[PDB]
Amino acid sequence: SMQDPIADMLTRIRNGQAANKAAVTMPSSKLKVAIANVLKEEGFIEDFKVEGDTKPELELTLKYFQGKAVVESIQRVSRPGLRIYKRKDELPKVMAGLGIAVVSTSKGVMTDRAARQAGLGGEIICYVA
C-alpha cells in the first residue's frame, strides 16, 4: 500500500530505466522533489518537471550515456519499517566515493558530499551510483 512512496520513486526509476524508458512520472510531493533535485544536480537524470496543482505530478527525464542507463543502481536505506540516521562522522560513502548517498538534514535534502561539508548529518534516505 502507498505506505512508502520514496521507495516507489527510487523504484519507478530503477524499473523504467531498466526498461530503457525515456521519461517517467508519479504523484509528487515536497519530498520527492527535493531528491529529484539532487538526482539532477548530480546528473543522474536529465531534468524533472512537476505538472499539476491539486494532483501534482513529478516527472523525471531519464538519461542514457553509452548504451547503459546512467543510474546503475538505486536503493532505499531508511524506510518506515526501519529508520536510519547517521551522525556526521558516521556518514556513508557510496562506491568508495563515486556515486552518492542522499541525506536529509536540519538544513534540507543534500548529498553525502554536501552534508559532509556542511558539517552535519541526518536521515540517509537512499543510495545512488
Partner 1 sequence: KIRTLQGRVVSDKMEKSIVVAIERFVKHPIYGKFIKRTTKLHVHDENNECGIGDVVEIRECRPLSKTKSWTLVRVVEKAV
Partner 2 sequence: ELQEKLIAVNRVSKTVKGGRIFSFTALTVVGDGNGRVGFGYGKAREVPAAIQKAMEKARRNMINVALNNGTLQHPVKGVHTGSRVFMQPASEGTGIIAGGAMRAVLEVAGVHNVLAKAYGSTNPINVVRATIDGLENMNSPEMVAAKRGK
- Give me the residues paired with residue 110 across strands: 103
- The dihedral formed by the CA atoms of 53, 6, 112 and 99, expressed in degrees to the nearest 10: -110
- Binding at 67: pick from partner 2, RNA, partner 1, none (beta carbon under 5-8 Å per type): none
In the complex with partner 1, the residue whose CB is nearer, 79 or 113, is 79
In the complex with partner 1, the residue whose CB is nearer, 83 or 107, is 83
In the complex with partner 1, the residue whose CB is nearer, 28 or 104, is 104
Q: Which residues bind partner 1 (CB under 8 A)?
A: 81-84
CB of 43: closest distance to partner 2 in angstroms?
3
CB-CB contact of 69 with 28 (8 Å):
no
d(CA 71, CA 68): 9
